[model samples]
Target: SMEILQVALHKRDSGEQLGIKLVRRTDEPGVFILDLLEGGLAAQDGRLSSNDRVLAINGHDLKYGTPELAAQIIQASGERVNLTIARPGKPEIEL
Candidate 1:
């Protein structure tokens, strides 16, 4: 069982990074948050976690996206990106 989690990420500089590494969906569809930098922006959000399956960026679906594809989608998500995530097992958060 799993739950869907939505999070809003404040946009960083165009050259800045999200501080999180993403992996191709090997468990299911969508990109997966592989890990986070100690002080990365995504980590700072405090609502995301490793293995969190990112299904969409803003309103864009990533049902068959690659890590590279996901990056572009996220980049284009604009100033405030709303991430739609699917967390397997008990979700630590919602919305």
Candidate 2:
């Protein structure tokens, strides 16, 4: 089986102390939301599980926006993005 490679911005892993890459912004009909596919260092931490909804990045709330705009937030300050993620029984952990 071939793995489908989803598109996303490639960030600077050098600056990233924790390797948590944000997945694409998804929209299906009436539903539009931001989510993440856990991978890399953050995934290794086991704090962020798969299919977690991203409420905000670096303390900035995510509006209904494109991944590019979100990437902008992530790239700014050249610091680790403190992601506010939501999952069942999981408190938000800064990444």
Candidate 3:
């Protein structure tokens, strides 16, 4: 089964300031991504860059975000949502 969480809809509509807008990740981990990579909602937004990763959605952790689950979040939000994402470039944080 997949994990599902409720996130505010605001960010999805308001734009990138709040949401990550899931894009296609490179095999290299962090690299240029494609918003249309998912082939759905995120593509409609037109703000998500190819190099974006859905760090969080509506304050929910995206560490477990999946394509099917992502579609759910995008379809059911209607408020000021929050999203944290990792942009392109070298990894700033190392573990």
Candidate 4:
């Protein structure tokens, strides 16, 4: 099962929080969402959830980028962060 979603986190002047915990496995290629903080940007966005895999950010594919580089891209996004995610466990279809 697979799903792709695009979500944006708008930056704030102060007190802005994205509120997402990410787990990057050195043994894997993509970054996986571990948790979404309640009342936070990601939580409120309603498009993301735990276990979702982030495939790209602003057209930058995580498959080709390291965790450190991904962090740098997020930090450089400044006022807006765009994410492309791949979610697992979609409903099955009979053939």
Of the two candidates 3 and 4, the one with more favorable lDDT, higher being better, is 4
lDDT of 2 at 47: 52
Q: After superposition, how far is residue 12 of candidate 2 from its true place, in Å?
A: 11
- Segments in model 2 whose C-alpha atoms lie over 4 Å from true places: 1-14, 25-39, 88-95
Q: Rate the local accuracy (lDDT) of all candidates.
A: 0.80, 0.47, 0.47, 0.80
* TM-scores for all predictions: 0.82, 0.50, 0.46, 0.80
Q: Write the per-residue lDDT of candidate 2 for residues 1-95, one digit (tens) a residue.
A: 21212223333563553444445533521112232235655554455545555556665665454556665776563434555655433345677
Q: List the residue pairs that clash in candidate 2.
A: none
- lDDT score for candidate 1 against the true structure: 0.80
**Model 2's TM-score against the true structure:** 0.50
Candidate 4 residue pairs in backbone clash: none
Q: Candidate 3 lDDT, tens digit per residue, 14-95?
A: 3333323344343443222343544444344445555566666666555655654655664565555544555546535586
Estimate the Cα RMSD of every predicted model relative to the unseen true structure: 4.7, 11.2, 9.5, 3.2
True-vs-predicted CA distance for residue 81, candidate 3, Å = 3.6
The segments of candidate 1 whose C-alpha lies over 4 angstroms from its true place after superposition are 25-27, 90-95
